[PDB]
Design an enzyme around this catalytic site. Structure first.
Site: not given
Ligand SMILES: [K+]
Ligand SMILES: [Zn+2]
Ligand SMILES: [K+]
Lengths: 5, 364
Positions: B88, B130, B138, B165, B167, B254
């Site tokens: 990553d 991240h 990430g 996001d 994630h 994303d």
């Molecule tokens: K989020």
């Molecule tokens: Zn993301």
């Protein structure tokens, strides 16, 4: 530990 | 009252060099410029973050390792796995300068808000949420979001971090999990095997910071209407209970339909409604980017969102510019949701929202 990717 | 836009040609070129998102910063700025939105903003050249500024969050050991592997591009270093460098986050040449640039840009944006030269500061190339104090993660090498919050902390006693996001923003949540002076709110995909694997509704922070972390686990296929319902419901309760003095907003694209991760099914319009809700609070607001791996759509989204911030309606047709050819097949600004199911059950969502309401009752 995950992978994003 | 004019939004600050963090930009320099040097800064964009640096951000373009990230292996996971090559040329994305150029495409975003090029489209924004093509709509002439930058003429309506205060363009501010970002500074490069000093070692000391980065050390306000990241450990010296980690920072020294980054600088080390950045010199030769030392992939296959013995200690790299421990510091999160790998698939990553590859150890590529010049990665330290990349980190310092992005960290410096978000700090510069935070400093603009502190100086009161604006109420909205924009860094679309930031939002790398991240990264841990001593670990890359990430696609994030440096947590610019944390550095920005720490800067804003010098003036604003309570800071709200909102993470839209795809994630879970685990780096920012972990950084502030033990404090009640920064509340983090994250809406994200949550499913076993999906990165980073954390951020269930039961995760609410620790110690003094208990109930000052809010997590909203969401499933594949969510669209604008339901997403805004969820977001508005949480943010309304959070705003009433926490009473923030400043907002840090992470708007990773994303989530947008057309992203190769193909999880959420959002359009910029839906995200824009969440943005408008936060903007009408009239608080000092730091706007960050983040994920987004359909590069044209990410540019579409953040250009649209920039228009939202400026209160302008943009032409539906993508104007001719350097990357016009990448906007097929229809060459329009709007994005059409994919024709796939929404996996979110209303009773699950309702249970999640009730769990959060209960947690926020403790926030006083
Ligand atoms: K989020
Ligand atoms: Zn993301
Ligand atoms: K917290």
């Amino acid at each position: 530990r995950h992978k994003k990717x | 009252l004019v939004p600050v836009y963090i930009y320099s040609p040097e800064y964009v070129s640096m951000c373009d060099s990230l292996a996971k998102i090559p040329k994305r910063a150029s495409m975003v700025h090029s489209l924004i410029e093509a709509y002439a939105l930058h003429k309506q903003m205060r363009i501010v050249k970002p500074k490069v973050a000093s070692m000391e500024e980065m050390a306000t969050f990241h450990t010296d050991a980690y920072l020294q390792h980054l600088q080390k592997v950045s010199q030769e591009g030392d992939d296959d270093h013995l200690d790299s796995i421990e510091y999160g460098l790998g698939y990553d986050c590859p150890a590529t040449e010049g990665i330290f300068d990349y980190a310092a640039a992005i960290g410096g840009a978000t700090i510069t944006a935070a400093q603009c808000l502190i100086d009161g030269m604006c109420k909205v500061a924009i860094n679309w190339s930031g939002g790398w949420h991240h990264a841990k104090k001593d670990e890359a993660s990430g696609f994030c090498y440096l947590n610019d979001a944390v550095l920005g919050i720490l800067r804003l902390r010098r003036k604003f006693e309570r800071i709200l971090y909102v993470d839209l996001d795809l994630h879970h923003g685990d780096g920012v949540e972990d950084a502030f999990s033990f404090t009640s002076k920064v509340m983090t709110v994250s809406l994200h995909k949550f499913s076993p095997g999906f990165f980073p694997g954390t951020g269930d509704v039961s995760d609410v922070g620790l110690g003094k910071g208990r109930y000052y972390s809010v997590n909203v686990p969401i499933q594949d296929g969510i669209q604008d209407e339901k997403y805004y319902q969820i977001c508005e419901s949480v943010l309304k309760e959070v705003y009433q209970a926490f009473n923030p003095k400043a907002v840090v907003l992470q708007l990773g694209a994303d989530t947008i339909a057309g992203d190769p991760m193909c999880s959420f099914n959002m359009t910029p319009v839906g995200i824009g409604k969440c943005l408008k809700y936060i903007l009408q609070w009239q608080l000092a607001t730091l706007i960050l980017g983040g994920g987004g791996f359909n590069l044209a759509n990410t540019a579409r989204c953040w250009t649209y969102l920039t228009g939202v911030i400026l209160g302008k309606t943009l032409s539906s047709e993508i104007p001719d510019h350097e990357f016009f050819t990448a906007y097929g097949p229809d060459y329009v600004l709007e994005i059409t949701p994919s024709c796939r199911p929404d996996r979110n059950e209303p009773h699950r969502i309702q249970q999640i929202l009730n769990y959060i309401k209960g947690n926020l009752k403790h926030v006083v």
